[PDB]
Design a protein around this ligand. Structure first.
Ligand SMILES: CCCCCCCCOCCOCCOCCOCCO
Ligand SMILES: CCCCCCCCOCCOCCOCCOCCO
Ligand SMILES: CCCCCCCCOCCOCCOCCOCCO
Ligand SMILES: CCCCCCCCCCCC[N+](C)(C)[O-]
Length: 424
């Protein structure tokens, strides 16, 4: 699912985030649906983190003869979460949380033959949320939330074997016999595969809002609709390329060379909005069933475009994402006053059309299998441990002169501590 994260709590991880937004056994879920606030009787707190260990691989051969093989190109990630919820009165409450809905990390050796389209790609995101909720009656609740998103990003690309390729082209050509042609071949051969062809970095705050509706049949069965708005991050940061000025203005398909000098740069990143419907059903004093369909408007993310203080394009990449859905189903076994158990599955289709796949964000349809458990120390305190495994199909990728194959899987492990305070 592109660069979206769902890892906002360890219990959620055990459910495979199914019907999140209709469950309120810990404070974690208010981030997902502000209306769940009305479900809380006293100040409740939750803090933990999810460890994501991807194993994503690339295979292929460049036209140069060099291998396009790259193993383990998605570094492990630690995603923290922190949550708080508290009543105001019989019909009002509020919450705050620190989560992450968007994140991405890909890394190739700066010597990689295909380095002009896989160097380093890093996006980390933090969502500061502040919600309030109104209890209309025993059935209807409403939530309204505001989000301050802090985002830190970095892009780096290298000349892989392009220097070699270009030199070959010249030398095979009639210009191979010319002084002019030879000098260019020399220059091309001279571009090391670790020559930095593009650098971007910046951090910026962005802002958005979210809303949610909660409907309860009884104390054991509810349903929810939630909306999370788009958030536009307007980066202003640094752009650089180690290539000589002399490369620019011939219309070659490359980022603007700056001879290593840094230029101020502007790029707008769109974090897509998301809708979600959720259902929770406590079938039995020990058994619950939960499920959700979520819809993310990835079409809101069309490209990476970077711009000088003069309006010139310094670096551009077409993304052309399409809207995508995530669906999930899970169960919870409330064994005894101490132990709770859970498992779930989810599926998410890639928002990246095959013809726009790229190796920096090698995405495919995914499945999650998860299981988790909660131990309750004492009605006031509990720890949540969750495990999830994700599997993705292998997919074909075409960028520039290169053809790749990609496969990805991952293990997720997470722990959360929960505390509940003195009632009213
Ligand atoms: C699939 C990637 C999504 C997230 C990418 C950025 C998220 C930040 O992860 C960085 C991973 O680095 C590990 C964190 O460092 C260890 C922190 O643990 C210290 C405990 O206090
Ligand atoms: C020049 C402004 C600073 C640029 C910030 C970098 C923004 C890159 O973030 C995009 C993350 O999405 C990954 C796209 O995958 C390809
Ligand atoms: C300069 C105008 C910007 C238009 C394109 C921006 C996006 C470019 O990214 C394409 C990535 O290709 C990088 C390859 O650069 C060439 C390195 O080797 C050239 C030496 O022969
Ligand atoms: C350091 C000199 C760099 C010269 C590159 C010129 C590229 C011409 C391509 C058409």
């Amino acid at each position: 699912a592109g660069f979206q994260l769902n890892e906002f709590s360890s219990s959620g991880l055990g459910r495979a985030y199914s019907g999140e937004g209709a469950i309120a056994d810990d404070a974690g879920n208010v981030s997902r649906n502000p209306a769940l606030i009305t479900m809380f009787d006293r100040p409740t707190f939750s803090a933990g983190a999810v460890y994501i260990d991807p194993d994503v691989n690339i295979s292929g051969t460049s036209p140069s003869g060099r291998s396009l093989k790259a193993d383990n190109i998605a570094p492990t990630a630690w995603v923290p979460n922190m949550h708080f919820v508290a009543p105001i009165n019989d019909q009002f409450g509020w919450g705050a949380s620190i989560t992450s809905n968007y994140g991405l990390a890909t890394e190739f050796n700066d010597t990689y033959a295909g380095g002009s389209v896989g160097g380093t790609t890093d996006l980390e995101t933090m969502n500061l949320n502040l919600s309030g909720a109104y209890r209309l009656n025993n059935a209807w609740s409403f939530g309204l939330g505001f989000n301050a998103v802090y985002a830190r990003a970095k892009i780096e690309r290298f000349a892989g074997d392009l220097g070699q390729l270009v030199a070959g082209q010249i030398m095979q050509s009639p210009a191979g016999q010319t002084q002019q042609g030879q000098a260019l071949a020399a220059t091309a051969n001279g571009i090391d595969s670790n020559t930095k062809i593009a650098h971007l970095n910046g951090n910026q705050w962005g802002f958005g809002w979210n809303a949610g509706i909660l409907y309860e049949l009884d104390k054991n069965n509810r349903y929810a609709l939630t909306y999370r708005s788009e958030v536009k991050i307007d980066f202003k940061g640094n752009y650089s390329s180690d290539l000589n000025r002399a490369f620019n203005n011939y219309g070659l398909p490359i980022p603007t060379a700056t001879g290593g000098a840094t230029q101020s740069g502007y790029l707008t990143l769109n974090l897509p909005e998301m809708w979600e419907v959720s259902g929770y059903n406590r079938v039995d004093p020990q058994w619950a069933i939960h499920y959700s369909l979520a819809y993310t408007s990835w079409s809101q993310f069309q490209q990476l475009k970077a711009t000088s203080t003069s309006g010139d394009t310094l670096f551009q990449k077409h993304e052309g994402f399409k809207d995508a859905y995530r669906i999930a189903l899970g169960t919870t076994y409330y064994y005894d006053d101490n132990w709770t158990f859970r498992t779930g599955i989810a599926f998410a289709d890639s928002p990246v059309p095959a013809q726009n796949r790229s190796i920096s964000i090698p995405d495919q349809d995914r499945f999650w299998l998860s299981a988790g458990t909660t131990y309750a120390f004492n009605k006031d305190a509990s720890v949540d441990v969750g495990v999830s495994y994700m599997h993705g199909q292998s997919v074909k990728i075409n960028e520039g002169p290169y053809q790749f194959e990609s496969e990805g899987k991952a293990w997720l492990f997470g722990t959360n501590f929960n505390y509940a305070f003195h009632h009213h």
